[PDB]
Design a protein around this ligand. Structure first.
Ligand SMILES: [Cl-]
Ligand SMILES: [Cl-]
Ligand SMILES: [Cl-]
Ligand SMILES: [Cl-]
Ligand SMILES: [Cl-]
Ligand SMILES: [Cl-]
Lengths: 395, 395
């Protein structure tokens, strides 16, 4: 049997295999038509975005995301339309020779740009994405699947209709097939399992979204080759070591880090406060940990302004872990390609941690850092060898 | 929702995460108990294998696989039992230090053997596998999932019962958890999609089985990093080039190759006959191609003995492809990490092929070879750094 997400991903692969062979004039042309269709329907899009903003205001939405949601504030919409033209006007990203090497007489190797394949784009609260990604995908010869959050449902619906319709309407003229771009109108998380068909995930949102995607997928994530890296600060963590090791994981960077803290580790809060007011690090705490951290600070009078604003470059999450076994369990839920560290003076715990974790690399009392959207990440490479009958048996 | 195969794979991952931390005495001990249980139940296993042999004889089964099916011929069963002991007697494969490097004073790096993780073992018609793989898996700290073919259903059933029961019976004594080995009694091909949980596929059967597995999975396959590589011999293939290029793909090897032949390519049979009686290559033909190949040979009187036996090291399949577009379609159904070649003098076709294929590397009139069970492949490596508070900021 074929699931909904499987069929979506399969159709994307089929669409991409046609899209990759369509001329630049055909791929650029559909972008001009789409620009025109979006402009001609601006008023309908604006009304749908108006429903979205007002719905978000009346429910729980943070004034930051709310400002990202407004497509018609200032000249946001006009810039988005302009970006479609800018992209359509670029030189063909595909079929460019990056490297040519004469291997032997009449035997030449080329490295040629080619589409990545199929893109899954997951965004939250920024409707501009639909236009930017549709443009970049068709231009670069990639099929795309787009999934937005609840906040833009109305704007997403209207824009999807216009792109779907325009692609259908101009297929015979442009060559660009229906399905080149599929805009998923909440019909699932099974898409992240389709790594036989999907080549790249492009996340457009918060750090929390990236972390969630990383843990639920084997498809490469644009800009994030590594999984979440954890430091477990054990009950018997040395505090000086715990402070230096944990700070060093910041001052080295585009990486996703979790601090796993044993509550029985004495002065564990001095470690978080040392990260904030010495490394300028923002700490994304779980509710129960933040409530415990703030109480210890307020009891000491040390709950300064500089802590309150930086407790919710580098990510850094922090949560409790009440034993070595619990730290292991937490670590073993992360999608692989991550390193992990334990800070402890207890050898029985260190050895248990190192035997227990699913990790490429594991550190005991040493820093994990000892381990050595545009068209950018949307084109890959194909090698082509063009000879005249040469075989691997030459003298 | 969680599918049957997802739950199987998830439980395997959970089992493996416990199994990896059980002592060698515990892992070796369960192997001795399993050896004893299989020996004590030999007569029951023999009766079940008797049903299997007689069922296979009365239906369509090839005397080759039939001979693999007989567990009690000669001393096959006694050797299998002996192999369990041999494995239980080996030195712990896990926790061995392969490499130690002093990175700095009191900062040392180790490369330590560790389990691969979860193994999916798919075999056809060889019941010995159940014992060998169960032994190697538990010994090396890997959880295993076993799926056999229809031919051994009875022997598989009886043996599964004995292993399941023994693992359950001795869990509190050995530490080795229920689920360390799951023997799937036809309850699916969805397991090959579980690459978030399954780390390695171990195929134990024919080349056709390997090819099928390779095309239906993103999980690495033991002994087969590369996908199926195709050579398309176009209508306008030069015959001298077609012969040399295609022969060279043999005389270079453990690889899976398909020859895609255009029927309108003149003397295309001379290419297959050149592979057989010059490279000693066996050709695994589709029915319609073999029937066409034999007729052209019989019409020329050239259907020798040496062709008939070698038409059904290197695999080499052969099938028809009636255009460049059809060759492309065929190639694009293969799971990635493969190179592909077109042999043609037609440039429009060559360029279409190179633009159309999903391939790392593509060759036009040049040979694809220009691209540069024991405990062996069941242990991977973990790096461990053991310091005393050292951070990535040293002078
Ligand atoms: Cl070129
Ligand atoms: Cl150049
Ligand atoms: Cl050159
Ligand atoms: Cl060691
Ligand atoms: Cl050594
Ligand atoms: Cl050393």
């Amino acid at each position: 049997h074929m699931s909904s997400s499987q069929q979506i991903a399969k159709n994307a692969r089929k669409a991409g295999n046609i899209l990759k062979t369509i001329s630049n004039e055909g791929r650029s042309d559909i972008l001009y038509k789409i620009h025109d269709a979006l402009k001609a329907n601006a008023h309908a899009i604006e009304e749908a975005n108006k429903i979205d903003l007002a719905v978000a205001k009346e429910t729980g939405l943070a004034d930051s995301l709310l400002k990202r949601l407004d497509l018609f504030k200032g000249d946001k919409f006009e810039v988005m339309l302009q970006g479609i033209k800018d992209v359509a006007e670029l030189e063909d990203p595909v079929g460019k020779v990056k490297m040519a090497r004469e291997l032997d007489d009449g035997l030449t190797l080329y490295q040629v740009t080619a589409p990545v394949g199929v893109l899954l784009v997951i965004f939250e609260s920024r409707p501009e994405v639909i236009a930017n990604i549709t443009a970049l995908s068709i231009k670069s010869g990639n099929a795309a699947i787009l999934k937005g959050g609840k906040e833009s449902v109305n704007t997403f619906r209207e824009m999807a209709k216009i792109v779907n319709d325009t692609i259908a309407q101009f297929q015979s003229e442009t060559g660009v097939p229906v399905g080149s771009v599929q805009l998923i109108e909440t019909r699932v998380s099974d898409l992240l399992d389709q790594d036989e068909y999907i080549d790249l995930v492009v996340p457009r949102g918060s750090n929390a979204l990236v972390r969630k995607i990383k843990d639920t997928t084997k498809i490469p994530v644009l800009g994030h080759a590594d999984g979440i890296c954890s430091i477990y600060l054990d009950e018997d963590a040395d505090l000086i070591k715990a402070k230096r090791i944990s700070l060093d994981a910041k001052t080295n960077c585009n990486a996703m880090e979790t601090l796993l803290i044993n509550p029985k580790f004495s002065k564990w809060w001095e470690v978080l406060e040392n990260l904030t007011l010495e490394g300028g690090v923002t700490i994304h705490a779980t509710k129960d940990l933040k409530t415990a951290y703030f109480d210890k600070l307020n009891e000491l009078g040390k709950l300064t302004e500089a802590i309150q604003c930086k407790t919710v470059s580098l990510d850094l999450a922090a949560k409790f872990v009440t034993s070595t076994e619990s730290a292991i369990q937490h670590i073993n839920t992360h999608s692989s390609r991550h390193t992990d560290a334990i800070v402890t003076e207890n050898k029985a715990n260190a050895e248990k941690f190192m035997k227990g974790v699913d990790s490429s690399g594991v550190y005991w009392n040493a820093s994990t850092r000892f381990a050595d959207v545009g068209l950018d990440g949307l084109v890959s490479y194909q090698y082509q060898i063009r000879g005249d009958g040469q075989v691997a048996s030459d003298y």
